Amino acid sequence: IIPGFGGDFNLTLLEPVARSAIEDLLFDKVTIADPGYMQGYDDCMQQQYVAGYKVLPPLMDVNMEAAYTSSLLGSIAGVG
Amino acid sequence: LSLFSVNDFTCSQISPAAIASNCYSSLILDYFSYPLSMKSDLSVSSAGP
Amino acid sequence: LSLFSVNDFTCSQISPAAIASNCYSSLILDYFSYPLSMKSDLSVSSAGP
Amino acid sequence: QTGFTTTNEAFQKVQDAVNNNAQALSKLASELSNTFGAISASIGDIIQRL
Amino acid sequence: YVDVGPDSVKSACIEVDIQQTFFDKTWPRPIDVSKADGIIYPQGRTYSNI
Amino acid sequence: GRGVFQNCTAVGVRQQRFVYDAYQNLVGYYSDDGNYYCLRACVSVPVSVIYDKETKTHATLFGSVACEHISSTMSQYSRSTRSMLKPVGCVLGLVNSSLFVEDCKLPLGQSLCALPDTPSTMRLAS
Amino acid sequence: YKLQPLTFLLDFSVDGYIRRAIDCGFNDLSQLHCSYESFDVESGVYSVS
């Protein structure tokens, strides 16, 4: 990834470095229903899910997911 | 009911008020002499002789 | 319960042991004269009138 | 970038997916529970009232 | 079981004049749900912002 | 009912001593007669069995966070295996399995979380 | 004003007083508010009984 991508083709999808600003904007705009990863039980004690169903983890880190998007962003021009 | 004094009145699967005032396609009735001393035998749940 | 011997004890929708120790909004008590012959007739709901 | 609110149908679809999982999970189980219980509907008053 | 006030002693009761037309004045005051007019609070429990 | 009370802002008319939230569950407002104290529901930790058949090694897992408060063989938690229980860096849970997770390791393995990967030889790949 | 058995949507504030309520039988809109359990409902065309 290079900060300058296009000749006056201002691209804002640059990752600030992972978590691209457009990706961050949609996640912030959408309701943050589940901030309970990495802090769920402490939060359960501050204000483990009711009784029974327990939300399982995603299996992919937003950083690894960002790395997959980063590979796609770099690949755009070569396949183009 | 007026003709004979009733020792007991019990209706099953129907209301006593409903049996007095309901519309039924057909009425079937049986009259017989049954002793007061033996009333337990004539019960659907029980199996008396 | 110790003060009065109970000829018939029936508890509906509640445990007999629970009534003594349960905590609730309000206590309701009723008293009346009942015949032993009509003790069987008396019920929360009965076919008999 | 400026318009990512109700105007964007796809953003509404993302919100619908988040709402669908939550309603089918936490809301559905909690509402269904207590509905089938005649008395306490949770502990069931096994020794408390029965 | 009357108590506090003595009763059954009076010389006479005051004469009463009744005129319906004077009392017939129209001032309508309909119940409003939005203002919660005449609405009993649930006796079982008080509630939060729900 | 099981309850935990912490200082909270006063809410409710105060005519009734109980506040409920659209359910039979009770917010338990004003548990103290003197001051308002919000009640809490029963709190529990989930357990997940990480098992490899050929290795025949079993591991214990917890949900979201266990490093900050929960401890191994805690007196507070009544049921583990329903008989006996069964110290690592904080992640999705405080795994009974140790060794810890190396920063770089083979991606392929038993499913687990965003970064943890389960191998066989107990080990915690990334 | 006479009292009649009725189902009413009730709004409780942080103070806990019932600032607003819905009759739920007065008109089609009141029934719609009860269905969604919300004073405000999304704009649209809704069937009524």
From TrEMBL, chain E:
Specific enzymatic cleavages in vivo yield mature proteins. The precursor is processed into S1 and S2 by host cell furin or another cellular protease to yield the mature S1 and S2 proteins. Additionally, a second cleavage leads to the release of a fusion peptide after viral attachment to host cell receptor. The cytoplasmic Cys-rich domain is palmitoylated. Spike glycoprotein is digested within host endosomes. It is found in: Virion membrane; Host endoplasmic reticulum-Golgi intermediate compartment membrane; Host cell membrane. It comes from the Viruses. Glycans are attached at residue 49. Homotrimer; each monomer consists of a S1 and a S2 subunit. The resulting peplomers protrude from the virus surface as spikes. Spike protein S1: attaches the virion to the cell membrane by interacting with host receptor, initiating the infection. Fusion peptide 1 (FP1) and fusion peptide 2 (FP2) function cooperatively and have a membrane-ordering effect on lipid headgroups and shallow hydrophobic regions of target bilayers. They are considered as two domains of an extended, bipartite FP. The membrane-ordering activity is calcium-dependent and also dependent on correct folding, which is maintained by an internal disulfide bond in FP2. Belongs to the betacoronaviruses spike protein family. This is Spike glycoprotein. It comes from Human betacoronavirus 2c (isolate EMC/2012) (HCoV-EMC). The chain holds residues 18 to 67 of 1353 of the full protein.
